[PDB]
């Protein structure tokens, strides 16, 4: 029907999950205006006139929509592969957030992924206390910005480097990681890179996963067919490393590595060279050993080994409930169903809404195109602002 | 401004039918990009290939869901112009009857001229006057621009004039309606420039509406408009608009009154006052209006009409209407006992069309497609038409 058509077409500009919603549409025009404003291209009149026409309009759009200058940068709280994360304060709302910047130039220069796409979707729509939340996603001619809730507790790498983690704490953190990974698996994703670096702590000391750079969607039979290895050298599972066809079992390998590192102090397959770490991983059968540690309980050693085995015998091959049922978790302080409502082992004592004490101390683009390059095309639709899921 | 205000303002901008960035214009921008990039030479670039491959399934859905030409059943081609053809159509679903002006995108780009249609769209779309033909929908594709208007079954004034020796009483009515119609356009901030009987359309009731606002242009701070554009068929063109060629020339609304005088002349006399075989001869006669304007030796034209014709067929500086419409309105030619200016369109028109159906084309005379070459690099042929789409409610 004529009505049906205009209704169906209408829901398409509203749906935050739609490829053609106002957010993508605005981005698309904003992209064209950016990718064409060069003298060599402006020599063509169709181009010159189009730009000259939308000049006054596109600037209004640019000022009205979310821009980076809307945020006052408090401190650079982190640095990664393709950009930097920063504690910011939205100048108008005076609200405090953690903002992940991703250099559009850097990614384009042999990025090979489009990794930020599921990183956006997961954070934007997860709706889990276990996933860091995306409030706004916006861009410009140089970067991709992710405006997420700030985790003042810092990461697990910081906790571990400041405490000799008692088993009682390791139990809590491991358990929370199990709940957190399960949530991601339920969303249909395999995390592919579970490490302390991605474990973040809130105002209350409770866990959230961040940086789903490596996330991939599981197929019909809960598998991923990635022909190349993905992850971190110590936490990588041997199956992922060799590749390949694999399942969620790989994220449990990583849990075992994390449990080991917390209680032992080092990674189970650590070796001088990164190649030596790879070697030790492939020989997990004979390389996994425990020091003379009267502290590491029989159950913990069992759990570590139940996760640090070949995929086919891994704890978690038959689901989370077999991990949950493990005696290591048997305790009188929390129940799985209410674990995040219990009181954390390390409650952060914070000085302000901008206390950066749990984050270590910290502080070029594409050339002018000869012809049409379309450098801003692979980022059309990244904006999460005009049409969001409230 | 607050963050909230800033969000809300940006929201109203995707809703406003008067906005350059409302959802329909934005859809156009993407639709254009998809059309202007789907070529193998450009697809050699991955940024391009991936963008297209990504939006492929989406853009097709958009194409079928949005208003298309195949939504309309063409009844008869009711007209033909320079860059396309007008046609009486019936919307297949609603079964509603409209006039549809088609414009060839290839022809417009080919002939340099590709922007006249803007002021035509806006005027018809937003005028909201009984004097302006109404635009209900404006839509496009890789080949044409489409304007879906209300059908004027009464036909044009050129047809009326060719079928009747217009009595002065009728000419008074038609002239008066044209004055009200032009005033409405001027009020909107536009000068028509080349007014003529061809642009005077008659409704189901025989009342007037202006159409074909191609030559139309928006006035500046001082109610003036500057132009370079070479203008053909000078018969109704004012000597100031003719003088203006190359950008040398700023003129006002006074030029549309010149054309009224030409129309009043043609109705009562039977021919155009400056008609000559060649178009150059018509131009020559216009520039020499002072000595070329003459009336035939038959007592038939009334003194008032002659004065009015001459009051409009003078140099800009002394033209009736240089001091506003009220001085035209006050002219003795209009002095009558049949209508009042304030209620003229509520009166019973001199020629009421007797029509056979909702598709009666009796007042409209009886009536290879070149294609764009493939481009080695980015041509952007679709860009001058981004945002032409408009829907009503
Ligand atoms: C992929 O290239 C980068 C660029 C910058 C930083 C990183 C590491 C990273 O992904 N860092 C994240 N940090 C948070 C965070 C930090 C503090 N509070 C809440 C969330 C969420 S993801 C990777
Ligand atoms: C130069 O570009 C063209 C292309 C096709 C036709 C024309 C002439 C024209 O502009 N003709 C019009 N006719 C109506 C109309 C006719 C009947 N009923 C309602 C509207 C509105 S504009 C010009």
Residue A172: phi, psi to the nearest 5?
-55, -60
Let me know: does A98 contact A87? Beta carbons within 8 Å.
Answer: yes
Q: Which DSSP category does B188 fall into? A: T
- Give residue B127 CA to ligand 2 midpoint distance, Å: 17
Nearest ligand to the C-alpha atom of residue B194? 2
A193 carries an active-site annotation: yes
Q: Do B62 and A20 touch (CB under 8 A)?
A: yes
Domains of chain A: 1-154+350-390 (3.30.200.20), 155-349 (1.10.510.10)
- How close A153 comes to chain B (CA, Å)? 28
Spatial separation of the C-alpha atoms in residues A11 and A31, rounded to whole Å: 24
- How close A220 comes to chain B (CA, Å)? 22
Q: Tokens 């937003």 belong to which residue?
A: B126
Q: What is the dihedral of CA B14, B19, B24, B28, to 10 degrees?
A: -120
Question: Distances in Å between the alpha carbon of A178 and those of A181, A185, A233, A255?
Answer: 5, 10, 21, 8
Task: Choose the residue to mutate in B101, B160, B196 for probing ligand 2, maximizing ligand atoms within 8 Å of C-beta.
Answer: B101
Q: Which helix (H) or strand (E) holds B345?
A: none
Tokens found for residue B73: 């059943």
- Give residue B135 CA to ligand 2 midpoint distance, Å: 12
User: In b/e form, how buried is each residue of A341-361, taking b as 16+ CB within 10 angstroms?
Assistant: eeebbbebeeeeeebbebbee
Spatial separation of the C-alpha atoms in residues B254 and B320, rounded to whole Å: 8
Q: Which residues contact B66 (CB under 8 A, 6 or more apart)?
A: A9, B27, B139, B389
Tokens found for residue B233: 């068929």
Chain A to chain B, count of Cβ pairs less than 8 Å apart? 111
Question: Distances in Å between the alpha carbon of B21 and those of A140, B14, B388?
Answer: 18, 6, 11
| Radius of gyration of chain A from its Cα atoms, rounded to whole angstroms | 24
Q: Which residues contact A245 (CB under 8 A, 6 or more apart)?
A: A223, A224, A225
Nearest ligand to the C-alpha atom of residue B364? 2
Q: Do B51 and A374 touch (CB under 8 A)?
A: yes
Out of A26, A28, A378, whose CB is closest to B47? A378
Let me know: does B80 contact B367? Beta carbons within 8 Å.
Answer: yes
Chain B CA closest to residue A53 = B384
Question: Distances in Å between the alpha carbon of B347 and those of B19, B20, B173, B351?
Answer: 37, 39, 10, 12
Q: Do B14 and A386 touch (CB under 8 A)?
A: yes
Q: Tokens 């000559």 belong to which residue?
A: B276
Q: What is the resolution of this structure in A?
A: 3.4
Residue B49: phi, psi to the nearest 5?
-50, -50
Residue B56: phi, psi to the nearest 5?
-50, -65
Q: Do B10 and A386 touch (CB under 8 A)?
A: yes
Residue A103: phi, psi to the nearest 5?
-65, 115
- Reduced to 3 states, what is the DSSP secondary structure of residue B93? coil
Q: Which residues contact A262 (CB under 8 A, 6 or more apart)?
A: A160, A165, A169, A170, A173, A174
Tokens found for residue A65: 């929509």
User: In b/e form, how buried is each residue of B109-137, taking b as 16+ CB within 10 angstroms?
Assistant: beeeebebbbbbbbbbbebebbbbbbbbb
Chain A CA closest to residue B93 = A2
Let me know: does A302 contact A328? Beta carbons within 8 Å.
Answer: yes
- Give residue A356 CA to ligand 1 midpoint distance, Å: 14
Q: Which helix (H) or strand (E) holds B304?
A: helix B303-312
Q: Which helix (H) or strand (E) holds B138?
A: strand B135-140
- How close B4 comes to chain A (CA, Å)? 9
B-chain CB neighbours of A24 within 8 Å are: 30
Out of B20, B51, B109, whose CB is closest to A57? B20
Spatial separation of the C-alpha atoms in residues A18 and B28, rounded to whole Å: 17
Residue B104: phi, psi to the nearest 5?
-70, 115
- Give residue A260 CA to ligand 1 midpoint distance, Å: 24
Spatial separation of the C-alpha atoms in residues B6 and A92, rounded to whole Å: 10
Spatial separation of the C-alpha atoms in residues A235 and A270, rounded to whole Å: 10
3-state per-residue secondary structure call for A88-124: EEECCCCCEEEEEEEEHHHHHCCCCCCCHHHHHHHHH
Question: Distances in Å between the alpha carbon of A96 and those of A21, A64, A140, A353, B257?
Answer: 28, 20, 21, 7, 64
Q: Do A12 and B62 touch (CB under 8 A)?
A: yes
H helices of A308-372, in order, are 320-324
Of A103, A120, A122, A123, residue with least CA distance to A111: A103
Spatial separation of the C-alpha atoms in residues B331 and B333, rounded to whole Å: 5
Spatial separation of the C-alpha atoms in residues A76 and A362, rounded to whole Å: 6
Out of A20, A36, A44, whose CB is closest to B58? A20
């Amino acid at each position: 029907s004529f009505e049906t058509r205009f209704e169906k077409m209408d829901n398409l500009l509203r749906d935050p999950k739609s490829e053609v919603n106002s957010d993508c549409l605005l981005d698309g025009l904003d992209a064209l205006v950016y990718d064409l404003d060069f003298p060599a291209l402006r020599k063509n009149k169709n181009i010159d006139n189009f730009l000259s026409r939308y000049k006054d309009t596109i600037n209004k759009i640019r000022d009205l929509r979310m821009k980076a200058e809307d945020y006052e940068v408090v401190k650079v709280i982190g640095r990664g592969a393709f950009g930097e994360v920063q504690l910011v304060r939205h100048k108008s709302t005076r609200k405090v957030y953690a903002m992940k910047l991703l250099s559009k130039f850097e990614m384009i220069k042999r990025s090979d992924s489009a990794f930020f796409w599921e990183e956006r979707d997961i954070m934007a729509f997860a709706n889990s206390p276990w996933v860091v939340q995306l409030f706004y996603a916006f861009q410009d001619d140089r970067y991709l910005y992710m405006v997420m809730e700030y985790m003042p507790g810092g990461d697990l790498v910081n906790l571990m480097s400041n405490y000799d983690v008692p088993e009682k704490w390791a139990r809590f953190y491991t358990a929370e990681v199990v709940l957190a990974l399960d949530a991601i698996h339920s969303m249909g994703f395999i995390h592919r890179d579970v490490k302390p670096d991605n474990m973040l702590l809130d105002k209350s000391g409770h866990l959230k996963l961040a940086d789903f750079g490596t996330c991939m969607k599981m197929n019909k039979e809960g598998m991923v067919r990635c022909d190349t290895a993905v992850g971190t050298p110590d936490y990588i599972s041997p199956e992922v490393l060799k590749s390949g066809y694999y399942g969620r079992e790989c994220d449990w390998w990583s849990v075992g590595v994390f449990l080991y590192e917390m209680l032992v102090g080092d990674t189970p397959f650590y070796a001088d060279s990164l190649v030596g770490t790879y070697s030790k991983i492939m020989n997990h059968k004979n390389s996994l050993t425990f020091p003379d540690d009267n502290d590491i309980s029989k159950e913990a050693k069992n759990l570590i080994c139940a996760f640090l085995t070949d995929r086919e015998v891994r704890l978690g091959r038959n689901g989370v409930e077999e991990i949950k049922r493990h005696l290591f978790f048997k305790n009188d302080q929390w129940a799985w169903e209410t674990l995040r409502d219990t009181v954390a082992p390390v409650v952060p004592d914070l000085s302000s809404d901008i206390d950066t004490s749990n984050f270590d101390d910290l502080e070029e683009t594409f050339p002018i195109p000869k012809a049409f390059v379309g450098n801003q095309l692979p980022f059309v639709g990244f904006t999460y602002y005009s049409n969001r899921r409230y």
